Tab-separated table of C-alpha atoms in Angstrom:
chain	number	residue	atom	x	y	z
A	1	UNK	CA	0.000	0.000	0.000
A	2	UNK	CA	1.462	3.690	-0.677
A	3	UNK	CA	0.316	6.981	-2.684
A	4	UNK	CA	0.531	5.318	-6.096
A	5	UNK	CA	-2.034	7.969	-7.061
A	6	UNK	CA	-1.356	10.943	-4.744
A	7	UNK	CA	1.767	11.414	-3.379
A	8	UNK	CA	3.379	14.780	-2.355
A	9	UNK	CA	7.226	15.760	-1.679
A	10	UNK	CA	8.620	19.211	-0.955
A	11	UNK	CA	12.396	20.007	-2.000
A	12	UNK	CA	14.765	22.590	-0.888
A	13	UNK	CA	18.391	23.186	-0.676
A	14	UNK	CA	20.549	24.171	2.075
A	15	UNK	CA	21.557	28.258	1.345
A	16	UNK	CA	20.857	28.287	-2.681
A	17	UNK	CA	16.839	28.776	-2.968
A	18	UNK	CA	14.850	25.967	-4.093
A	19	UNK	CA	10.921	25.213	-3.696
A	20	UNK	CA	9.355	22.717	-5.786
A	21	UNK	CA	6.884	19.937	-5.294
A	22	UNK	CA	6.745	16.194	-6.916
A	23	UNK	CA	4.875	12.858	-7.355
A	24	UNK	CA	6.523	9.470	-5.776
A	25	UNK	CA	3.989	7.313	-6.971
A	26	UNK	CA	5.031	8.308	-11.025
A	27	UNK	CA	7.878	6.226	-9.344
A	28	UNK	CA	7.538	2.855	-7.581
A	29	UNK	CA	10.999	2.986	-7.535
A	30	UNK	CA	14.151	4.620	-6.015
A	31	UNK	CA	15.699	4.666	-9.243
A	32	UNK	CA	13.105	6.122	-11.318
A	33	UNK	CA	13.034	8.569	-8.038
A	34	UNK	CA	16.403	9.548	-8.860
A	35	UNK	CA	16.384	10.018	-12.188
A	36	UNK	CA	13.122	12.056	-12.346
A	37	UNK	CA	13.694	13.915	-9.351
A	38	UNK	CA	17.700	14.389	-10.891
A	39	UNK	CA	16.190	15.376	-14.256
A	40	UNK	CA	13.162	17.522	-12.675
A	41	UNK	CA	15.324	19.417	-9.993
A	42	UNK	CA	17.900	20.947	-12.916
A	43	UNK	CA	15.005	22.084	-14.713
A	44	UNK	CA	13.472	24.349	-11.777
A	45	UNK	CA	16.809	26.126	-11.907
A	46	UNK	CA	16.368	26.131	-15.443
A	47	UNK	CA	14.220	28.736	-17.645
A	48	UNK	CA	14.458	31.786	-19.620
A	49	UNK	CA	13.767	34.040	-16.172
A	50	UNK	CA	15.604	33.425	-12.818
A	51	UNK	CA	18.416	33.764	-11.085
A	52	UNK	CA	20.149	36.670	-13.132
A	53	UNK	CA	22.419	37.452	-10.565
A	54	UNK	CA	24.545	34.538	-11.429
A	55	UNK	CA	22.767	32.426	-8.903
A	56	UNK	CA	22.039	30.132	-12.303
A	57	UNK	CA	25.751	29.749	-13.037
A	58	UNK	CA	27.343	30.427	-9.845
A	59	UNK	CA	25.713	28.561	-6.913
A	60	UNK	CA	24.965	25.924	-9.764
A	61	UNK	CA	28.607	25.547	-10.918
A	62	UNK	CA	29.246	25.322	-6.932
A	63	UNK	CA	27.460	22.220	-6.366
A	64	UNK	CA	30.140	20.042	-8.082
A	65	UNK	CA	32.628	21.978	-6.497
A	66	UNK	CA	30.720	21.724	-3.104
A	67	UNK	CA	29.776	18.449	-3.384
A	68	UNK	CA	33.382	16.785	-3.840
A	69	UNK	CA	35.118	19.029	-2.040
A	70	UNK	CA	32.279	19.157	1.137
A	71	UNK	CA	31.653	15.341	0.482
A	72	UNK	CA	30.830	15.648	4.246
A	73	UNK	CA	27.337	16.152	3.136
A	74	UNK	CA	25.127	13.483	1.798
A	75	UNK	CA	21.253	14.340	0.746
A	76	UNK	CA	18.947	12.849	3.704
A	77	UNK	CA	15.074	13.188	3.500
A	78	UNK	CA	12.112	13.919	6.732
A	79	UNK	CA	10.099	11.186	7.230
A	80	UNK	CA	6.349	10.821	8.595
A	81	UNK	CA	7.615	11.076	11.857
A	82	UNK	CA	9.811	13.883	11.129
A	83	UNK	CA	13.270	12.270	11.768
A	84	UNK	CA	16.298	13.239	9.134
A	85	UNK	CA	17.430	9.915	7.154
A	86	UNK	CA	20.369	9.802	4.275
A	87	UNK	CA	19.079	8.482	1.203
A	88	UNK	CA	18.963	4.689	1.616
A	89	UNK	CA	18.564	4.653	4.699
A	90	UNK	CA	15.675	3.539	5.249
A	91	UNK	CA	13.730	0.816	2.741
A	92	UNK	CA	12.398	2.108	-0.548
A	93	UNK	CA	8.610	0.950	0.476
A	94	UNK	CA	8.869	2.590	4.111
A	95	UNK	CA	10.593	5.785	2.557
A	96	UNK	CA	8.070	5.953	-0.669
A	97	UNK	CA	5.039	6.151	1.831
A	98	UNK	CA	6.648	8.006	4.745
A	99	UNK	CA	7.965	10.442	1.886
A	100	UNK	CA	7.256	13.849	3.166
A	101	UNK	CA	9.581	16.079	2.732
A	102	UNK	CA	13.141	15.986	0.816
A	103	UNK	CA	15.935	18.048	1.013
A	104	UNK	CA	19.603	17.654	-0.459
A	105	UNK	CA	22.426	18.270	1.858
A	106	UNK	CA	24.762	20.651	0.131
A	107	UNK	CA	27.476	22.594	2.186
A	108	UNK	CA	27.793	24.898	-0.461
A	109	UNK	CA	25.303	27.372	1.324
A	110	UNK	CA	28.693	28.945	2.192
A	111	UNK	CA	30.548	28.685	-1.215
A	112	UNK	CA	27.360	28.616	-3.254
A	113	UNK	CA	25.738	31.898	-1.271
């Protein structure tokens, strides 16, 4: 049993804005997760209007930079009960269900920002 028909997940990243909701249930799985979420994320800082400061080629160009060299930080999502888990933590059926809110870890709010 699961949202397979109505499921909701908020995302946000750590310093760099983000706000966008998705659908779990258009994937039963952690991989199709991934690679939707993956694909759908770089196209909300994607579009003709946005961050013309830079924030579209700097804090983006950051999160490679960030990400290897702060590879302290791991994304980890908030489950039903509201505890922080890394990604895998916790199994794919509990997480797809529980899946409430998601946010990617990224200690580039100081490099990024």
């Amino acid at each position: 049993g699961g949202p397979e028909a109505a499921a909701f997940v908020k995302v946000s990243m750590d310093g760099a804005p983000y706000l966008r909701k998705i659908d779990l249930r258009m994937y039963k799985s952690y991989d199709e997760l991934s690679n939707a979420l993956s694909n759908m994320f770089s196209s909300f800082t994607m579009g003709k209007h946005g961050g013309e400061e830079g924030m579209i080629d700097f804090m983006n160009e950051r999160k490679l930079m960030d990400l290897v060299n702060s590879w302290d930080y791991v994304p980890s999502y908030e489950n039903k009960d509201g505890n922080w888990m890394l990604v895998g933590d916790v199994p794919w059926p509990m997480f797809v269900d529980t899946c409430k809110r998601l946010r990617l870890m990224k200690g580039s709010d100081a490099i990024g920002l």
